[PDB]
Amino acid sequence: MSAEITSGDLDQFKQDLQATPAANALQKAVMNNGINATAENTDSKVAMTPTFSIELDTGAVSNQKQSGRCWMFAALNTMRHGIQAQFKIKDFELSQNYTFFWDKFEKSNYFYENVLKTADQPLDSRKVAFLLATPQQDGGQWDMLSALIEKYGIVPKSVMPETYSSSKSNELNGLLNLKLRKDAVTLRKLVADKASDADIEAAKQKMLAEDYRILAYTLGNPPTKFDFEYRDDDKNYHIDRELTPQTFFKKYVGWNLDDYQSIINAPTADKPYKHLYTVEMLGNVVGGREVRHLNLDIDTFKDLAIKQLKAGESVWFGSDVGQSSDRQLGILDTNIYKKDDLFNTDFTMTKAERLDYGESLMTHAMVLTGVDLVDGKPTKWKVENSWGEKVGEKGYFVASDAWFDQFVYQVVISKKYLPAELQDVIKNEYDKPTVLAPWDPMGALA
Amino acid sequence: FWDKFEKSNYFYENVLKTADQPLDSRKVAFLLATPQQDGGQWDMLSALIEKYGIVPKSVMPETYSSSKSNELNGLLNLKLRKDAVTLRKLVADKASDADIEAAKQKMLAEDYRILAYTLGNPPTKFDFEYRDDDKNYHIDRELTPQTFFKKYVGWNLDDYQSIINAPTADKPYKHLYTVEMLGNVVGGREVRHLNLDI
Amino acid sequence: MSAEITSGDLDQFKQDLQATPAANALQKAVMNNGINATAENTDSKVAMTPTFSIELDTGAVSNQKQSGRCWMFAALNTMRHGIQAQFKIKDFELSQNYTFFWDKFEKSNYFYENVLKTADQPLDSRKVAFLLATPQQDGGQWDMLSALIEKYGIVPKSVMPETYSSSKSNELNGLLNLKLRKDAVTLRKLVADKASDADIEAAKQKMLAEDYRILAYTLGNPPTKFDFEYRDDDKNYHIDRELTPQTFFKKYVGWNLDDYQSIINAPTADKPYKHLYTVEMLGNVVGGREVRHLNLDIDTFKDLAIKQLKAGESVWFGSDVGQSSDRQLGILDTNIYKKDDLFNTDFTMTKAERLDYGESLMTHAMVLTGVDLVDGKPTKWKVENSWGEKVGEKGYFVASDAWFDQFVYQVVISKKYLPAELQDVIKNEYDKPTVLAPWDPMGALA
């Protein structure tokens, strides 16, 4: 029978195995050492030496620890390198716990509103199931971090330090997810029972009061007013009194968050280039700005990143960091392993096929801080990671240009580097983007 | 070993069966999201033992990947997804059943090799030597995984029922349930759960 | 030029490398993991499961630590298993420091006598150079341990415990070797200056007094009289008063050290079988018994070991433990690695060629405590090691019968298991053995 594995098929597979060149010796290597350590290629290590013709001076890395806050760390990295340079504060850090607090709390409300909106749909429907499977999580996207900063500002790390849960969020996500699911039961019931909008709003407010308390206990009280004291790199003391998170943002960072566009490269048939896309139900801050991705071809995408780097500005980016990577040495290179050679098997998929077939999507946000240009083309990119200093080169990674082609899906670029035609697409489509399904791969939260 | 290999075939057959359905359909997406994994259920382990028997640990020891399976699952999932592309294409192109079977056999030969390299060669014949708790030596020669199972365990795997307690409205008690598409061994026994009160 | 490596030869070697099956993938494995971890064979692990049709009950292992005292540990193991069984003292240990003290001191005198005997020969002569290269060392052979026990007896471990130097002998060997070399200068000078035998004896006695003090400081004072108190395995208390090392030996061990013969298997043309051999200048105790090895073919050698095991007695043996071995898992098997397969290169030598060409010799002494016999032939041997419990199976190793064939060179057998013909060879040749050169491989001290 064609469908089952027969004894004859097994014989044939064993024959194929024994006919494979050096099968016995390769088997012993992989049995003993595993895949990565058998397949890892020193030629890549040579090619990936961390030297870059364009290199920003970005100082020491941050460390998210056991949390999925890469998107926040990476965004705050872009802002804090601005602060460090302008105010001469070497290694200055912003509070990632601050953004984590407001993100979780806004996501709690976001979830309730999603539950209300789908409360007339069956519990086993694909969209209700998708909601309940992941009520909230640590990850996000650039426009969601902006939304948070627009509404809440930011503070120095010293002003809202890490706690147990911020640096090891598993127990908080477990309890908050349980809480949100329990509350989803109550909310669906209210809508089934034809409760008034006012009763439903009152219920939601009581639910939120409890969520607020879970986060205050886990993460601390968000600051509203503080003094900022520091010594600059010339050793001069400074004191700035009675700041708020919003005045601190305005003074020390000073960006107009409108100036930034999320650019993706998702080369699939449902996503023609030079348009804007959003993801249904995806978000954190009800009432705040929505996700908007501009899909562009990989050459244009990369040329924008280079333009931004050459101007002295770092670039937030989204990638599948688990692909073709040595995460200890910090080498992201399609050549770092030679698995196809090891197994005598072709493992090639295109970028479109990996998206469409669930093999790859953005899983991690980092920052480009350099690019090596040889004969005017990029060979390798310098990457600021947020896993602390004991991986890569003091916490910096290196990505080959082939790797970037395949496994980078998003960069955040200042609109001013964009051609007029693309500035116009953004303005023309802002209120009518193409709406992707919730489970779209570009709905991935990193 | 046998679980992963049977699951590779199971996955291909699931892909064939849904190859006329849109790629973004809920069932095709569910398949591709988790082509295989380490876990299972009781009836799937039985299916494996019925078909392949069992051996002492000393006779098929652990390897790197068996005790740290992340890299194996990553590469095997990649392989299965790549092959799903090819299989859907074959069905789109109205390939014959024989061409599609031949393709699947080549895919399986490769999967076999990934598992042999990661996990070792499954034994077919071995000697079993041990000392019992009274310190007496024993040697039993030229066993197979199936004769070892029959002699040292000796169960009729039919004698066992999976019982669940899932007190939900769609699952009245005192009936049998199965799960669509869920399995490892094509042609072997399916999952059957009897739902009962706690 | 044929003699030098040319660019053309290099080209050809690179071609040969690239034509090798799977060379790229195998290269990566060995570069990343090294030889052992690439080549180690799980089929051997399966074959080498530690089950044995003949198995002695020998309890817990000892641990020599950072010293080369394997020969002593192994001999004392054979004696202490006798004590444990006869007197019901589970895990009882004899003092390895006791034998270490007397060995070093006797070797100091042995060295001086060797220097005197060669004092008329040039300093750069092969035999004088061999002496000075290794004035003494930790290792030895069975007949040298007997010599020590005959002259000095033995004590419980509790009665002469380990010290720093006994368990980490490097500094003691360095200083003692320096001392002995300095004294060799003085001794040669005395013989050059035609000093009297009495002046030369007086000088040697002063040298020995100093050596005695170096060992007393490093190792402690050897006991002369002690009480022995213990509880047997039935929990009964015992006290035995005013023992000496010699009365303790006579009462608790009770062997006639004459009853034992060193048997070798050295299948080289200079060593016909069924004769006795000794090694020039090799020894420790001046005036005590000399080294005598009876060379026999490997089948006869192995059959004697099995006969002794089947009688319930363990067997001291000498081997090259670094050959074809995993010294963590404790597997000694010609199949544990498949290096020839890995490198596509034949690495085969016969046992005779490995001796003759300096590739192999006895480097370590252990004890056989079991043998698995299947269809009447040995498949694997149970090995008591002296490296403590965190290697092998609670400190026990397993050696395949193929490994034993190749890499075991010596076993110590009770004469009563020997055929009359071989009992007669021993008696007939005892005073006229064939004298091997000092640097003979069977002069190796383990």
Side-chain angles (χ1 to χ4, degrees), chain C residues 84-169 171-319:
Chain C
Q84 292 162 351
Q86 185 176 353
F87 293 87
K88 306 164 142 282
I89 318 166
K90 199 178 75 176
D91 297 345
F92 178 73
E93 268 184 291
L94 298 159
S95 179
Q96 313 93 347
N97 192 20
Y98 189 80
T99 41
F100 196 45
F101 183 104
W102 292 123
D103 184 57
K104 292 244 171 297
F105 192 54
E106 287 283 352
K107 286 174 167 160
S108 302
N109 190 59
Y110 208 95
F111 173 84
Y112 295 145
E113 287 296 321
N114 280 335
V115 171
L116 285 172
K117 272 161 59 175
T118 57
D120 57 340
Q121 300 165 29
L123 203 54
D124 65 7
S125 66
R126 195 175 180 181
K127 283 179 194 182
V128 175
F130 181 82
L131 258 184
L132 295 171
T134 317
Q136 55 86 47
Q137 60 184 292
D138 290 1
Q141 309 201 10
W142 172 270
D143 296 321
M144 290 164 65
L145 192 279
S146 287
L148 294 164
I149 285 182
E150 288 176 317
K151 179 170 192 175
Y152 297 112
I154 200 53
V155 305
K157 194 192 182 58
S158 64
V159 172
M160 198 175 187
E162 301 283 306
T163 68
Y164 183 104
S165 293
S166 59
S167 273
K168 189 161 165 25
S169 54
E171 299 149 49
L172 167 61
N173 287 312
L175 181 61
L176 179 59
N177 283 349
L178 161 55
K179 177 59 160 52
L180 298 172
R181 287 177 183 127
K182 174 178 190 277
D183 288 342
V185 184
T186 300
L187 292 173
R188 294 180 55 92
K189 200 201 193 229
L190 286 164
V191 171
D193 287 353
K194 295 163 189 165
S196 56
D197 288 351
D199 285 350
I200 289 173
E201 197 51 31
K204 193 188 57 170
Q205 296 295 318
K206 167 212 145 272
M207 294 167 182
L208 290 172
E210 295 159 342
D211 305 343
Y212 186 87
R213 174 166 68 254
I214 293 167
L215 297 168
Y217 280 15
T218 51
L219 301 183
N221 298 319
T224 52
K225 177 167 115 173
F226 55 96
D227 291 355
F228 181 40
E229 291 185 80
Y230 67 93
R231 283 204 186 244
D232 69 31
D233 296 337
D234 294 321
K235 303 180 195 75
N236 298 310
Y237 169 89
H238 301 270
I239 184 169
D240 193 348
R241 300 181 86 178
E242 306 222 288
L243 290 164
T244 80
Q246 304 191 259
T247 61
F248 180 81
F249 181 81
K250 295 181 144 91
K251 177 168 172 184
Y252 291 90
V253 186
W255 300 358
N256 176 0
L257 290 170
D258 275 321
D259 286 354
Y260 303 98
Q261 180 61 57
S262 175
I263 294 172
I264 63 174
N265 175 240
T268 54
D270 64 317
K271 302 176 169 81
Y273 297 134
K274 307 178 158 178
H275 298 287
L276 290 180
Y277 300 83
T278 195
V279 180
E280 175 181 9
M281 279 191 323
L282 161 73
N284 45 359
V285 178
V286 172
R289 71 158 64 250
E290 296 175 355
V291 170
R292 287 300 181 271
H293 297 304
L294 174 63
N295 203 22
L296 299 177
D297 71 284
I298 193 57
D299 290 332
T300 305
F301 182 112
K302 281 158 68 186
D303 286 342
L304 298 168
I306 293 163
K307 192 174 188 190
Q308 186 155 312
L309 294 171
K310 280 181 165 171
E313 294 160 3
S314 70
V315 180
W316 186 107
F317 81 106
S319 66

Side-chain angles (χ1 to χ4, degrees), chain A residues 65-116:
Chain A
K65 299 193 177 172
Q66 300 173 270
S67 73
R69 293 179 298 166
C70 64
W71 62 298
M72 308 179 180
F73 277 72
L76 294 170
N77 280 338
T78 63
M79 287 178 193
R80 81 199 179 92
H81 302 319
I83 295 174
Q84 292 162 351
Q86 185 176 353
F87 293 87
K88 306 164 142 282
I89 318 166
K90 199 178 75 176
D91 297 345
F92 178 73
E93 268 184 291
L94 298 159
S95 179
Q96 313 93 347
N97 192 20
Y98 189 80
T99 41
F100 196 45
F101 183 104
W102 292 123
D103 184 57
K104 292 244 171 297
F105 192 54
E106 287 283 352
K107 286 174 167 160
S108 302
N109 190 59
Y110 208 95
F111 173 84
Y112 295 145
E113 287 296 321
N114 280 335
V115 171
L116 285 172

Side-chain angles (χ1 to χ4, degrees), chain A residues 26-91:
Chain A
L26 296 167
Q27 170 175 51
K28 289 184 186 62
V30 182
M31 283 174 78
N32 294 161
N33 306 289
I35 293 169
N36 289 346
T38 301
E40 188 158 353
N41 179 12
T42 293
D43 296 350
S44 175
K45 297 173 181 178
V46 171
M48 298 291 115
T49 60
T51 307
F52 311 92
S53 70
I54 300 178
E55 191 175 23
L56 312 180
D57 178 8
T58 56
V61 307
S62 52
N63 189 352
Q64 78 195 56
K65 299 193 177 172
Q66 300 173 270
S67 73
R69 293 179 298 166
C70 64
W71 62 298
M72 308 179 180
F73 277 72
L76 294 170
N77 280 338
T78 63
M79 287 178 193
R80 81 199 179 92
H81 302 319
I83 295 174
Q84 292 162 351
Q86 185 176 353
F87 293 87
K88 306 164 142 282
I89 318 166
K90 199 178 75 176
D91 297 345

